Symmetry: D3
Subunit: 135 residues, 6 copies
């Protein structure tokens, strides 16, 4: 139950600079669960503008990654983003942080789906979110 970047490409149409997932560590047909890894390095173009004197990762991008993680799970049952409720960002994600991303389905309401995602670095909670995504 391993999907590397190449498998992920057959699944989503996202590509550089908006493929924000490196691999799928594990997936659950049954549990409607997924876990993804996005590695975070100084050598990604956003870190130049956000921010010049302090590389931090855009929250919205973590969310986009959770979203992309959510979107894949879907395709395993495209899937564009319809909404994103309750989103809270506890910790700065920097270059070096491996980013581990868990996303679970909770609502299947007629060609729409909803998910809860949490994002962690060394186990800690850096971000959680409710993601709403359809098609």
């Amino acid at each position: 139950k391993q999907i590397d970047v190449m498998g992920i490409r057959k699944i989503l149409p996202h590509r550089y600079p908006f493929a924000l997932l490196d691999k799928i560590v594990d997936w659950s047909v049954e549990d409607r669960t997924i876990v993804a890894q996005k590695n975070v390095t100084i050598n990604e173009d956003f870190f130049n503008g956000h921010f010049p004197d302090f590389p931090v990762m855009p929250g919205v991008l973590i969310v986009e990654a959770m979203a992309q993680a959510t979107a894949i799970l879907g395709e395993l049952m495209t899937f564009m983003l319809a909404g994103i409720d309750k989103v809270r960002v506890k910790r700065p994600v920097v270059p070096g942080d491996v980013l581990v991303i868990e996303s679970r389905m909770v609502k299947q309401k007629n060609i729409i789906c909803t998910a809860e995602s949490v994002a962690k670095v060394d186990g800690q909670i850096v971000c959680s979110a409710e993601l709403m995504a359809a098609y």
Copy 2:
């Protein structure tokens, strides 16, 4: 009333590829409001990935614009970071050629709407912290 992209650079520390506001057209301290503009063009790198064969502005970049709009109004109240983001409604596809007008009303927290040619494309509630 207005603030050009060089004014935005003295207020916020953001830069390329994450300066997502071209200019501030209005604001008002009294009223706790701001209107900003984000021009959208095929010549922005994110469209090469999102997606080949159909370039559409990703939802989350709409929010980030909204957030910078917000965090400038904020800075006029006297840098901010994005704590909470809530009630995010992605109506329509934003495409190369659309002009994005950004309304942010403070109520720190805020209500923001993003428009193309009158029409709402996005709305969201935005908590935020230094």
Copy 3:
């Protein structure tokens, strides 16, 4: 008579970073005119270099957008245009006047009119306006070459 970016691509081979037209607002084969639109934003790579202390669009990228709009017009008319006869590639530029700095947040409205045809060489006269103020005008020669 509107053509979105996806439409431009069927017509012009240009892709990023040298696709400098968002959409065609209007065309007329009968009138040999075209209106195009280029949105100018600070999220464009060239604004980092021209200039780092003060982003303003390069004169020559304005011209290039004029040239692209003229080549779409060119294509749309190739049955008319080339009655008596593969991409349109710029062969001359002549009456270029740059009147105003074009800055991020300007919408760039581009008018091009084809005024001369001569055995594969096309001449158009273009102007570009920001908030209906004249920002640049040019005479473009394109050759329908390989």
Copy 4:
């Protein structure tokens, strides 16, 4: 003596990547009011990805912009004895051959008119000593 490397060129003009389109000055002369500059053309410039995906050729406007930067440099070199330079006018541009990766673009510019904050040049770009493009350029010195 009459060379200026890319770092010298950085102190003369504010242009940076991706609109720094000169690698070095080869010769100049305030006395003859001419300058010889060089831009190397390589596949590993980004504009080649879009112009064109299946046939990389250097856009004509960029050759012109190379010539105007060389002209602006000549202007700056001549400033003391004429009194930033911005491109006000372009005329008579002829694009003569396609320029492709691996071509060394040698650029010659000669200042012909001084007319009150407005300068005016003739300029040619060459590849292997043959002309790929010519132009008259009109820069205006303004802050």
Copy 5:
């Protein structure tokens, strides 16, 4: 013991797209050793061209990451790469791999310096090499 990316920018002039180290995990001037990390993701420009159809990290950039951890260890005791030898590439390195870089200073004859280096993914060696750096300014 640790140095974040910010600390790294004070020691080395390298910047994007040639900053090839995220952080120093540890060092030791006594043993003359350094361990670095470099995260490998699909979001990195060089993966577009190497290769479209199969993104794999260029050997020569793995080496450049080695030479950069080395250069740090150097100033912890600019360093310009003057020699490379016995470079062996074992294993391809792809998006998702975390890339641990260990360098160890071997010789320090005058102004020329020399290191032994290794790069690893999940513990196994993916590349090794001997590097010669001169401290030319």
Copy 6:
């Protein structure tokens, strides 16, 4: 002239594409002598120069090495993709800055099943700036 290959020809031979396409053209080659001569122009408009170094642009020596290896892989292709099995004896002598033209010469010295060994040098203005010994595998 019968022995030139432009960038669109290099593309048919090697999968490397931007930003890791590092040869502009092949200038000469002998299938009999086991040689190739290629060129790579170097210019300020290359993105690595914004990082290497911000206040002083000079070509990473690893990139000179990568240009050599591509040259070497084209020659291997022409004698017959080749991957970079080994790099030995790399001398980085002179710094390479915008405005220089890298002339690259590769010489196939030995072979040992798929693994192949070349001697390779890099030239600016007839002077050597970099030399090395390369082991590419695969055929």
